[PDB]
Design a protein around this ligand. Sequence first.
Ligand code: VSV
Ligand code: SO3
Ligand code: CL
Ligand code: CL
Ligand code: CL
Ligand code: CL
Length: 439
Amino acid sequence: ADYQGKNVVIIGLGLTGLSCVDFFLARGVTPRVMDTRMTPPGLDKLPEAVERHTGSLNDEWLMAADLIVASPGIALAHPSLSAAADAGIEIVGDIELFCREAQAPIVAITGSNGKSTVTTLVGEMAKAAGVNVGVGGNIGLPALMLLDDECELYVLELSSFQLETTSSLQAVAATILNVTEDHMDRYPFGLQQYRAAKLRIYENAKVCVVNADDALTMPIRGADERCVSFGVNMGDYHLNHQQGETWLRVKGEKVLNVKEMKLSGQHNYTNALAALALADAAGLPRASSLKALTTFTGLPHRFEVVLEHNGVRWINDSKATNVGSTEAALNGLHVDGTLHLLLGGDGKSADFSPLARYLNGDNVRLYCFGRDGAQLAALRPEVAEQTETMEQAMRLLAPRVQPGDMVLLSPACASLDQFKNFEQRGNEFARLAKELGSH
Ligand SMILES: O=C(O)CC[C@@H](NC(=O)c1cccc(CNc2ccc(/C=C3\SC(=O)NC3=O)cc2)c1)C(=O)O
Ligand SMILES: O=S([O-])[O-]
Ligand SMILES: [Cl-]
Ligand SMILES: [Cl-]
Ligand SMILES: [Cl-]
Ligand SMILES: [Cl-]
């Protein structure tokens, strides 16, 4: 694309907004920046040469623009943006800018859960093959910071929001791993509108990889041209259970005994299948992809044991920012004693009801905090306590912890009411676990 001479407005600063500023400056185009926040992240890094407007959107700038680059963190349906759209002004995001320039194939991954594990796993499979790979998007480097002539493959985690502003993605392999209720605060036409944003990922993809166990991951149409599938008991890529052992299979052929993996648990096994299906479709050698599966240890904040001491496991699953992710932590969970489960934050208008089925018996205590702490306590009030903050909840539960217990932060909610991001929430949990979980 050629931006020379265009009046470009970037909405949203932070690292990804900065990447957009830098992208245009390097092409001899000076954009203007606006952000509804008064002191947005990264403001001190914005050169004085770049005009900016903070604390609100500026409709004089937006209606004057030739191109608007919208952060995924701003609603596309914001009345200032719908006005610019109605007037015919082009609106894109950073992923669109990236797709227009990229000179290597792109593997594109979205889903309500699993998407960072699967992105990182395919990145590791590529490295194991000696491929020069750029991994990022919605995690790691903003995609524009990955752009490099020497890159041979890009692996991008994409959110529903990024996909809404992307039109030129033609992925060598794309997947929606699953769709479960999330981001209802941003999708006023509910589950089908959220799904529709994700289904954009398959448009012009060479191979589509779908979840055979989740119908919502399947395009609304495909004909003589089907997607590759992964699943538990069915799929092109699927699991084979043998006594107590599990295998990854591809069309009936065993390819890996999961004992070789460092990741455990069924949903990691289906993540491994999805990653293998994407790697295969991207042309990576099967054997090096399987080697990567054996060496991968998981991400921080993903069901991460931050302390096992004095007979108690303290588990940081702060990456669980929706109900489906906490379900995946609870379903089949083995605890010898009491489970002390921390839930709380901004639930984004989610129905928390699906969690209730995991919370029966005499061996569960709930400690519920943040914006939606009361709604969470209401799942089972007789075993619940509510506090304002996670630290209060930790200090309340710790004296009650006995050998055999588990303390699990798997909060089912965004952290953004009280924290910068779920990493900060996990790091704080870890520090407090280490304080409270030894003498
Ligand atoms: O870390 C957590 O705990 C919660 C993370 C949680 N993330 C989002 O909902 C989300 C959705 C879209 C984008 C992002 C990251 N990028 C952002 C960029 C700009 C903003 C805010 C802006 S831009 C502006 O102009 N005015 C704004 O307020 C917020 C996030 C985060 C979630 O999944 O619940
Ligand atoms: O720039 S981002 O990562 O908010
Ligand atoms: Cl503000
Ligand atoms: Cl084999
Ligand atoms: Cl110990
Ligand atoms: Cl029980």
